[PDB]
Design a protein around this ligand. Sequence first.
Ligand SMILES: [Cl-]
Ligand SMILES: [Cl-]
Ligand SMILES: [Cl-]
Lengths: 242, 240, 242, 240, 240, 242
Amino acid sequence: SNASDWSLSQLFASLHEDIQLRLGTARKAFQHPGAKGDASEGVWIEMLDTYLPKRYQAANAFVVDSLGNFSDQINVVVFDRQYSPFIFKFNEQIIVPAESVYAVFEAKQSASADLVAYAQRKVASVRRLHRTSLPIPHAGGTYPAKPLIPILGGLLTFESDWSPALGMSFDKALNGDLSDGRLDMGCVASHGHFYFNNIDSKFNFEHGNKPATAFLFRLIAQLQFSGTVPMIDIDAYGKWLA
Amino acid sequence: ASDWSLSQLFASLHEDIQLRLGTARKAFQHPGAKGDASEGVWIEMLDTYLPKRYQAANAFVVDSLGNFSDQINVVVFDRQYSPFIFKFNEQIIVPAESVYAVFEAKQSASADLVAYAQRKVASVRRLHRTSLPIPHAGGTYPAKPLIPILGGLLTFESDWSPALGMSFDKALNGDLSDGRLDMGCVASHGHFYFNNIDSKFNFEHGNKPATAFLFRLIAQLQFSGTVPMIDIDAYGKWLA
Amino acid sequence: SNASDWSLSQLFASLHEDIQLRLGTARKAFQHPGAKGDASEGVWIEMLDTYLPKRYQAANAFVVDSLGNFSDQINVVVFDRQYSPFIFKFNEQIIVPAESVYAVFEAKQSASADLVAYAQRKVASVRRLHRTSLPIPHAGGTYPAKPLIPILGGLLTFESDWSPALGMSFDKALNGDLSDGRLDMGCVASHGHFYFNNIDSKFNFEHGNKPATAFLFRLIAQLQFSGTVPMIDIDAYGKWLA
Amino acid sequence: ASDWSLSQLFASLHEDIQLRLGTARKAFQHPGAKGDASEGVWIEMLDTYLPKRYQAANAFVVDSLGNFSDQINVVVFDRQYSPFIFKFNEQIIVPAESVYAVFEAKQSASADLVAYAQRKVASVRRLHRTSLPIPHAGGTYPAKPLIPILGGLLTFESDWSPALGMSFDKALNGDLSDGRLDMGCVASHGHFYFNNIDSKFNFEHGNKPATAFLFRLIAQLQFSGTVPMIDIDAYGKWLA
Amino acid sequence: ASDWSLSQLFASLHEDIQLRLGTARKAFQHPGAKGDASEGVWIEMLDTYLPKRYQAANAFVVDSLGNFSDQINVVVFDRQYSPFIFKFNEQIIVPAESVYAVFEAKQSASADLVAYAQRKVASVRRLHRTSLPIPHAGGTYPAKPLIPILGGLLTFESDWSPALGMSFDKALNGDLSDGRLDMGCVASHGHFYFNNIDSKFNFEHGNKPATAFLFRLIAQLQFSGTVPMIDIDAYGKWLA
Amino acid sequence: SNASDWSLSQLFASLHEDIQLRLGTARKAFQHPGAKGDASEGVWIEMLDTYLPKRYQAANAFVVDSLGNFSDQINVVVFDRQYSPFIFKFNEQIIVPAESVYAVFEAKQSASADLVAYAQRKVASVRRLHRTSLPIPHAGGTYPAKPLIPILGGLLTFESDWSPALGMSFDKALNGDLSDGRLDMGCVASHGHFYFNNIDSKFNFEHGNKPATAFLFRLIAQLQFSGTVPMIDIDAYGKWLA
Ligand SMILES: [Cl-]
Ligand SMILES: [Cl-]
Ligand SMILES: [Cl-]
């Protein structure tokens, strides 16, 4: 028909449906574990690359600090490049400084106790890294060194192994690490999303209502509180030239 | 999903097309934006999967006698051996000699839209194509006899119920001369093709419609070989 | 000859001449109204994409707000992406949030009373949209919510239907809408450019002297006063997930 | 460096490869990242220098009977006349008919790795390839007889000392049937190839190993011509 | 502008070239920048409009005997069947066997510049080209006889008055052996070509000079077919 | 072997080694002076493009000011585009306004007295240009016009003609221009890097220890002090439209 009545809700439905279908395809079509994970990770990266404000980069990377310590391989890193160098780039492979990182996510097919714990360990391998912070020159003078921003951590999946998908067993797993490995938010594309409520100090689950889009908006809103990364002391890295 | 499956690959290829065409239709509540969205999905499928000897894009077609076609939603054409006649940023005008196939892409099949597609196909087939003797590694071939230009219709849905039944067949039999459609796809239901042996249209229901259409197009295009060799000096008569 | 004497004026002449010739070509070469408009719009977009500071994006888009209302299709939107998400992106087609918008232009072949009124209606369809604004975290603390920036509106053409091209009839048309649809500036590539003088509350016309380049500089200088877009409340959009 | 020198150009082509492969091995202290880095260096060399009739990428290969290969580090394949079977962002599945050559890329040659490469090559050679009569400007060629698929091994180093000596030769003679390697490169030491006339493997030491391998590959590929013409309707049997 | 017009399309193609070449000359008051600007306009025209079997770029040319050409402003060459000899970011060295045509691009025609272009063309024509028997779908062709390399001169203006008259003709007749120019374009005035039948140069005034040159180039290139098949092992003699 | 022990020092070695090898290749492979310089310049540009924070652009360009004066051709300009237009762009060739410039470098094959003096003259041709600066609108109000930032100047080479490479003769050459043409830093890829110590008012040479990486870090750290470019008065350029 020729009817035209724009709908904002429909836009958010279509955004989510695209993610859910492509994650489902990645899982069904690729029977090789490496290709299946690469395909699924790429769906989440594309969503963040498309929709996050351009102050954020989203990519697979290793994180390193000025003490020479390295993270594990991080499936989805959200990081700064406006004010931050790469530490190393070789074709498409990148190593980013800890000071550039805003958020880190583990992307896997289905939520489980083992996967939640794995993600907690990945997040901890980043949060343990040392971050420098220098006084910041700007048009109005020099700000004090910015206090270190929280690094957001999370878990991105297509499905849940639990029944109900987002139930007490998922909550138990999330409460397994409330310190260096704490997961601030995550998405189960087929079911809902979760986030840590700092005021109540508990995890909240939200069912349905366009899970990937709801996760994306939660991430944008929480990232706003972080502002920009602190200003890196590249000369701390330079101690390793000799 | 225990093991690799060709059937699953072809299902996923098709499901991506069907879902994105449905998104284009639902999300863009503006006629121009909706058509642009849907056309781009079909063009992307062809760009991704057709052999690289084929280009696929929106274009006008023109011949060396100054006859211009209507704007064509989906033109499949050669660029390995053919120039553009004109390009201005994204807008292109191709010579008739470069064309392999022409498709109209719309939301839902109907008698009016089948007729519209038939007229668009005829408008390109009625253009004059030159053909020169072809130099090659072994010498010079005689001028290639002109290749048929394939035509068709690509939609998401059908206005008819049943979707791919007698009313659709009647519409397709409305032009059996130079607007005859060779093949088409209704992403939500199936695909169709002209059966030259039986001189009738055939419908195939389900069974991964976009992928089935894609394969039919590749197989039929192979019979055309490469485009005939253009006489660019015929176009050059318009320089004076 | 081998003489070399750099000229800044010549650079600005060549910038303008390129625009004027390509707009003329778009009009003469494409006898299909859709292709002709697409070709001309693309010339103006390319100029802004090439020369505007990179804090600005320039593209064709629809604008939407957190109340679910949509603008008309806008030929040339100047908007932020450094701090603003897309609301929806499908291949190259984009829907931007009202909070991201700096300026909106209608691009057509020739100025007339009807086209000026059409442009006024397009601009109004954007300015009527609701824009959120949150307190802004930054390295020095938190700014108050930024007061909403003006959205600049205008009209970009190749020719003028009036004789003289930029005369009292054009002025009359511009004075038709001094509120939601007011056109702050515009360019008639073959003749000159116009702008609203806020202090005198009248429209000023400038004839010749490299019209497209003069328009570009006027736009850059006026955009500087807007600073960056206010900070979007993405959770206002999130009310439409349920 | 008084004047232009072909030898210097070929030395610089090789030195770039050797240094970047060494960087990949040293810098990336993670097995997945290290392999990705090294594979990308070899793919970039082929992408840069092979004739554009050849594509080079990581891919799975599948045939029209549903047989799938293992993941292949470096596939050299046609896209001018061949579709993808499936593409999802960077991941691709190509039809067996499109394949010209397959290589395994690893850090250092060893008996286990030579055997691994032989098995990978056999896995692709054992796939079924269709071949149809080929329309062209002069008519229709008979179906092209199937082209050999070239196979090999690409490494930075050798675990053996001497690097390219009798132990390497013994490993290469471990598969003289459908896993036989045609050529390979050890960037730090030399290259090897199967000599069909003498029915033995030959090693060439130094003398710009990556460039020498590149040239051997180009020359050998020329004998294959273009891939046979795929029967996409054989794959279409999996639509139902 | 009531209706579509081929003449208008060809006028707009030419006017874009003429205006951009004039901008390059006026705006860039530095000899290196001015030449880079103008050369890029001509390369862009060829990149946009020539059939994709042709590449167009600035390059050096080298042969398998180690003879190097001067730097060539505009080389038209094959990459479908030909490797690069060397590539380092934007700088390329192509094998003589890949070359279809060579042009010098400058601001204004003059006796010195016509002679300069003749010498540049001769420098490429004097390089040795290999040619091997060519495998193809039907078998193996004999080695292709060597194709002529087309040469010419591309400028914005002419220093002579009249621009394209007897003095220009005299300069063109200064080299009728291996520096002979086949065609060229003076964007502000017309184009020229060697008439093999009459063994004389012909000038065409106005009538969309860049477009006329483009069409002449396409038509003449078609007679060359594809480049002969390179013997990369001839270059490989320089590995040792 | 299967050992995995990440090393930050190795990353910095590999970054430098890539630069040193590619500069050596440019010098050896291209026997045409224009191609050789284009090849070498491109190596340095790629390093800065890859690793500098994205607030910086790096390219070959001419610089112009609002008085109509032009610099010489600058091999490597580091400049802003987030807040600054191009003055002219024609295919890949660019002319940037003086207000956009952060740093300028001359890139050549081997350091010598003549090359140091040439670089000093190039840097002076940029520093002599006039830069405007306007009060800066931002989310917190309007900053005063930013005082003009120093433009960093330098010299980038593969080799040194002197023996020792970085000795008293190099120091003498650097002390030849301590004003408009002063070179703040530079790199001799095969030997080390140098920088001007403002506190001691002397040049310091650092030998080995990954020269290109050490230069890159020195540049990043010094650029941080400059903050962002002052805000351009595009209407000063607009005086040349008439
Ligand atoms: Cl018709
Ligand atoms: Cl097997
Ligand atoms: Cl010569």
